């Protein structure tokens, strides 16, 4: 078919399950991505993660686990319903766009078996600004010259940067949680990789 | 004709002057990612609405909405901690102010219910700019504003210092819970511990 559907994958917490890392240090992460972007400054996402897991191991007096928080972050499994990327990169253009390095982002997709079914990885770190700064959707939209495109994410603040930047939003909410207000608004819902690949069925 | 050396003071005020130990936690965390995430995506929400949102949320999520107007009033009548007392002895050597998230009204009524604004020269708020802290803005504002050149940010939250620095302000980190530094916040100017060692190290730098 001659319709063209492009869709950008949140990597951690959408693709990749955060679930068995230490909560608290996800959170820290997301902190120091939010905190540098608003004073224009730049950390690599690699740095900004080791520096954030071991502050918060020292506050709970586990430093000396730091090598296996770190390992589990390292070796991240993707959520079971991800096969249907099979199907979906049948249908439409199935790109990554991540606060993560495309060097990162390529190890975990390719340990996981899914990086054959994208066409492209995109990394916050080629505009030095992390989500959600308009500049990084932005960036994904002009390196592939596109109009309209669709984020998919689990990830409230990541659906209200795509929408912000002028990009469509599908919500992926597998947790079936409440909705945080901030990202009380995007375009579709589902609850798992296979509602998405029935959605875009019928969108196509 | 004495003490013509000015030293500005520009104080932090929820977490540094007034104890946030008493509200929910995840509720405050919460409070001050949308004060980010708004600011990264160039939107602006009223504090007091952020407040209400986020408390709301944190709470449905716990299953305990129906605590929503009990909650909220624990925001609204935050105690200052004691050793703020201090800052009738700074504000005789120091020129005090308020640079907050809150808007200036909010900041006034806390500040007045705790018999502290008597002790500030001036509020401002970060609502001046339509942008949150550490936002460079938020700092300029305050420094075009009195027309300083340099002036201390005084808080016990880690984003304010770096904020404070990225924007041209010295920095005065208050440690109280004597905690391990937060490494974004790790190069303040002076750690003191509260705000009696705060005047004496005033009174050193006098």
Redesign the interface.
């Known amino acids: 078919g001659s319709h063209m559907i492009i869709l950008a994958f949140d990597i951690f917490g959408t693709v990749l399950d955060t679930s068995t890392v230490i909560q608290e240090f996800r959170?820290k992460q997301l902190?120091?991505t939010?905190?540098?972007?608003?004073?224009?400054?730049y950390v690599e996402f690699e740095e900004i993660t080791k520096?954030t897991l071991r502050?918060i191991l020292?506050?709970r007096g586990e430093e000396s686990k730091f090598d296996e928080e770190l390992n589990k972050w390292k070796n991240l499994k993707a959520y079971e319903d991800t096969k249907y990327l099979k199907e979906i990169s049948e249908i439409a253009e199935v790109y990554a766009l991540s606060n993560g390095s495309i060097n990162e982002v390529k190890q975990h997709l390719e340990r996981n078996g899914l990086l054959r079914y994208f066409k492209g990885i995109f990394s916050a770190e080629s505009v030095k600004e992390y989500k959600?700064?308009?500049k990084v959707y932005k960036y994904f939209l002009d390196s592939i010259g596109a109009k309209e495109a669709f984020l998919v994410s689990s990830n409230a603040?990541d659906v209200?940067?795509a929408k912000?930047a002028g990009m469509r939003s599908i919500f992926v909410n597998r947790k079936n949680?409440?909705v945080?207000?901030?990202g009380g608004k995007p375009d579709v819902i589902v609850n798992d990789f296979k509602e998405l690949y029935e959605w875009i069925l019928r969108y196509k």
């Not at 939010?34 to 400054?41: D, F, H, S, V």
Request: no cysteine.
């Open positions: 959170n902190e120091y939010w905190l540098l972007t608003i004073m224009g400054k520096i502050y020292k506050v959600p700064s308009p603040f209200i940067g912000n949680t409440i945080d207000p901030i």
